[PDB]
Write a protein that binds this ligand. Structure first.
Ligand SMILES: [Mn+2]
Length: 265
């Protein structure tokens, strides 16, 4: 009946139940046109695909199913994704409403199309991605990986100390996600830092890093972020639209990375 709550409570459950929704992939969800879902809806459809065991990336509405050449298997229940309708004021103002979609594995008769390994060394195509992001990446024998907004650079340790390029680039993807949201770019940090503002950042960063790593073929590192799920639980309980604001920032952090990395002069 209430959307923000309804969605926040699914996410609060997943956290308690073990895995927060957005970690569940370890294929990104698509609409009937091939356009990928964004933001909070990627998160929601991921948890939904895990919880119902879906193999397909595609989600349809009853309308999209029927008038495409198919039928929603009766008994099948959809799940709630997010979008905007309009109210009039003086086709005018947007407002957030939910809606129901069904995965392709709940549907019969749909058309035909509908259903790596990196060692321990530098990878050229990954190196080109992060070089094309624009990020000051500095390397030093200091054994910590971090983003310093004050200098505005990412510091990686040396790749060989990782004994895993997959571990090396996931960590970099994570820092690249933080690197967005410096004042010159996405403008996301708190002004005055504390246990709450670090908690928000690394949640945006986490959700965002899953989104990034899904595209780059990497696996996110979740050891580093075990001390926060409680603040996330607390903040998610006290604020029923907080998860929407995080997922929107997260998607913007992934978008900025990939868009820069394709800024072909
Ligand atoms: Mn971080």
């Amino acid at each position: 009946f209430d959307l923000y709550q309804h969605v926040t409570d699914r996410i609060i459950a997943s956290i308690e139940a073990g895995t927060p929704a957005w970690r569940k992939p370890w294929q990104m969800p698509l609409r009937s046109n091939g356009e990928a879902y964004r933001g909070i809806n990627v998160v929601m459809l991921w948890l939904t695909a895990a919880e119902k065991g879906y193999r397909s990336a595609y989600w349809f509405t009853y309308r999209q199913a029927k008038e495409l050449g198919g039928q929603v298997r009766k008994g099948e229940k959809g799940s709630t994704v997010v979008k905007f309708g309009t109210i009039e004021r003086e086709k005018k103002i947007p407002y957030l409403k939910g809606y129901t979609v069904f995965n392709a594995d709940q549907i019969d008769g749909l058309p035909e199309q509908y259903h790596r390994d990196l060692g321990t060394a530098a990878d050229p195509e990954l190196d080109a991605f992060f070089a094309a992001t624009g990020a000051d990446i500095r390397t030093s024998s200091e054994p910590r990986a971090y983003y310093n907004p004050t200098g505005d650079y990412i510091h990686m340790p040396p790749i060989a100390t990782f004994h895993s390029a997959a571990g090396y680039y996931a960590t970099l993807a994570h820092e690249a996600t933080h690197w967005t949201g410096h004042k010159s770019r996405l403008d996301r940090f708190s002004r005055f830092s504390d246990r709450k503002s670090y908690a928000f950042e690394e949640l945006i960063a986490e959700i965002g890093n899953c989104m990034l790593c899904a595209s780059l073929g990497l696996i996110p590192d979740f050891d580093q972020s075990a001390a926060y799920v409680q603040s996330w639980l607390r903040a998610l309980k006290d604020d029923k639209r907080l998860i929407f604001k995080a997922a929107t920032e997260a998607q913007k952090a992934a978008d900025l990375l990939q868009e820069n990395a394709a800024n072909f002069q």
